[PDB]
Amino acid sequence: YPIINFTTAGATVQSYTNFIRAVRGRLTTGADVRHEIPVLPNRVGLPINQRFILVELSNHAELSVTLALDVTNAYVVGYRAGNSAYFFHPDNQEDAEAITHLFTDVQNRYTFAFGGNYDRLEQLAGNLRENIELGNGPLEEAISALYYYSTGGTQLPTLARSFIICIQMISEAARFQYIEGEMRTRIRYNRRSAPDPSVITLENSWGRLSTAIQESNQGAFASPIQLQRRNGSKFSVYDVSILIPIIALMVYRCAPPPSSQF
Ligand SMILES: Nc1nc(=O)c2ncc(C(=O)NCC(=O)N[C@@H](Cc3ccccc3)C(=O)O)nc2[nH]1
Numbered sequence: 001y002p003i004i005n006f007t008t009a010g011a012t013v014q015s016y017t018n019f020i021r022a023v024r025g026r027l028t029t030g031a032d033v034r035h036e037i038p039v040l041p042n043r044v045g046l047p048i049n050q051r052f053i054l055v056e057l058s059n060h061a062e063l064s065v066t067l068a069l070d071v072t073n074a075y076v077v078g079y080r081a082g083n084s085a086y087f088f089h090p091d092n093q094e095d096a097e098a099i100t101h102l103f104t105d106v107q108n109r110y111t112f113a114f115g116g117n118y119d120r121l122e123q124l125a126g127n128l129r130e131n132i133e134l135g136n137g138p139l140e141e142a143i144s145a146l147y148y149y150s151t152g153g154t155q156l157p158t159l160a161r162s163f164i165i166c167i168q169m170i171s172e173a174a175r176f177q178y179i180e181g182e183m184r185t186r187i188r189y190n191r192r193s194a195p196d197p198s199v200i201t202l203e204n205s206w207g208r209l210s211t212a213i214q215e216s217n218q219g220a221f222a223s224p225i226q227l228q229r230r231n232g233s234k235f236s237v238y239d240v241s242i243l244i245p246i247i248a249l250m251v252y253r254c255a256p257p258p259s260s261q262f
Contacts, residue, residue: 001052001068002026002053004053004055004056005058006055006058006170007059008058008059008143009060010060016187017180017184020174023053023170023174024038027040032252032256035213035244037213037243039251040073040074040251041072042252043252052101054067054068054069057139057143057166061144064143065143067170068080068087068102068103069171074171074174074249075116076171077095077102077116079146080103080106081146081150082150083107083150084106085110087099087112088114089112089113089116090111108150118167118203121160121163124157125160129194129203132165133194134194135187138192139166139169141162141165142163146159168183168199175206175247176206176247177245177248178246182195182198182199197232202227202246206251207251208225209237209243209247210250210253212237213240213243214254215253216240219241224238
């Protein structure tokens, strides 16, 4: 599987931007672009050799971990640190089979009994996303925490917190230019901060936004989607147009309707 490298060591806006762009480039082809917004490959009939990408994360502490991302949804399905690999509890038998194709040379393979969704990870972390700081420092620390899990150095709440950091700074940033921008800001000033309601509501709405765009009538939503601004106030989305600078990738929901051209 293709590997994309990022390091927190001396990270800049440019090096992070290069990284996120490269992740997007490995997640998607140019085959499926709707209202200027790329769609991830359809799960249905996707060959196993095209199913995953690998994100090799290094830090200033000279430690490396490799995340495995599912190309169908940019989901972090598990990770490798040295001679151990850990996978989140699969949703189904097909996904369970799929992950057997990841880190095949690794000495120790584990599947967590828990799923990798935010709700579960927040429960285990003892903190919600809104109270978990993001930025280069948190990511540096997250890489170390993932690295030391197999040897007993990392408590489960810290591991869960560290997953939450990685997921948002990689997968969510890939999904949303807006979230990429929010991480760029944190990196630029080297100041960690928890995600505000604009970030949280985008994350929570990714599936619904993807479906609404794909089901839209020439871009127009049948039902508006409510997001939140930075201050927590409501922002109503009626149309794909407003989302073009915000959403970089969509999960596949359906084949697009025939070209609507007059
Ligand atoms: N491990 C992991 N990798 C991710 O990329 C990821 N990305 C997102 C979430 C998550 O709970 N999101 C909250 C949410 O409301 N998700 C929606 C939208 C969605 C997000 C990601 C993938 C598919 C759908 C849903 O589950 O329906 N969890 C993740 N866990």
